[model samples]
Target: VVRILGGKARGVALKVPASARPSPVRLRKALFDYLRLRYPRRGRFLDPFAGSGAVGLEAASEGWEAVLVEKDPEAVRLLKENVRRTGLGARVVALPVEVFLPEAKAQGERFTVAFMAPPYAMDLAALFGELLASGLVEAGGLYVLQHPKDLYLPLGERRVYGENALTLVEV
Candidate 1:
């Protein structure tokens, strides 16, 4: 039930399978609005732990070359369908975020912007710490990780949207 808030895919809705977690429409709106002001459009975008491709697809519509990583096969199908239906320039990587980062690093692939909407069970510190150490994001790149409002990790600048919290970091 989540829709692309802005960009070329504005008004296009993406389906969220039962196994996928959806980002609220308001939260998505707030996130993109804030990102528009700061990062602008960085050609390469990464969406690690992309459950339903909402965030990464939105980035594609906004002119970013987005690569979404999803380990779940079913979720990956939805992600691929969303990309195909939208006809936006986005790629879905059929791998876990943990594995994708290492491969990306090996390929010398560095992105300018990345947004992670990880599973609640995933370790925030280990995930982000590994991301930083992997050097997958370019220096001075923009990154954001979504979480609930209650848990606050001093990852970077924190912005809360109702019950959701977004931690924005500049690498």
Candidate 2:
């Protein structure tokens, strides 16, 4: 029950879901630490397939405008409750991740950081390829896809960061 680490509304605690494929708090801390080096200008953080909204919540806690996309209606319901509980109902937008591309393209909105942490077994590479081709990702924006260690994505024009199941692409 750690308090909200940051934001205009600080010291707020979040509801950690039991069934979420939660990135370990330590993992999140480390990820943000490294991200700060690359992305010093804080902006919106988009978390597609925002299971339990943990990653989005973490971004909100970090003072970044966090937008969450969850297709499952049940997950959206729970995510909304968690957003309100953390006093991030205004800062976080919880919607279906699939709608992000179409809606953003229609509205002409762009994101600085996009987190595409879909189910490990799903074809995430294909999804990422679509996102890249959509031209919705901002220039210099980072796309973080967390999958199983052995998962191989048919990526296009991108370089693997390392063997940590992550890729850093510049658009």
Candidate 3:
């Protein structure tokens, strides 16, 4: 069981499903560091494809308003349960990524940082394409993606967000 490694809620415990792809504690910490360093002001954050609500919960716990997106029926159920258990209902919104991303895109809803941890084997280019096209991620905003280390990611023409080189992007 990986726990909340830092912050006011540090040490909170949660299960890490074999397939949930919980961010490694190291990576998770680095992500927040980047978020703060890049966007000092509190703003909306997104975790589409949220697996255990870990990312969303963490962001909210740190005082950043967030929207979590997940499509798996069971996962969605568990995510809500976790949010309630953690007393994070006020700071996080759980929705299906399919429904959430497009809707946010349609609304021209930009974010300070959009967090994504899609299946490593999926089409990252396509996903990033949508994110960029959506116009999310404000001027200094970022989109953090966790993809397979073995795969090559193409930023193409998008502006690179400052922070960790491994999983961070901006447009």
Give the local distance difference test score of model 2: 0.67
Give the distance in Å from residue 156's predicted Cα in candidate 3 to where it truly belongs: 8.3
RMSD of each: 1.4, 3.6, 4.0
For residues 1-171, could you state the per-residue lDDT of candidate 1 as single tens digits?
788878898888787896655777788788878767767755688888887798989988887888899899989888888887787877788998778888899899988888887887778767877776777778778778788778787769898888888888888
- TM-score each candidate: 0.93, 0.79, 0.82
Q: lDDT score of model 1?
A: 0.82
lDDT of each: 0.82, 0.67, 0.68
Per-residue lDDT of model 3, residues 55-76, tens digit only: 7778877777878877777777
Better of 1 and 3 by lDDT: 1
lDDT of 3 at 87: 68
lDDT of 3 at 53: 78
Q: How high a TM-score does candidate 2 get?
A: 0.79
Of 1 and 2, which scores higher on TM-score? Answer: 1
What global local distance difference test value does model 3 have?
0.68
Which candidate would rank higher by lDDT, 1 or 2? 1
Tens digit of per-residue lDDT, candidate 2, span 104-155:
7789878888877777667877777766766666887877767655666645
Give candidate 3's total backbone clashes: 0
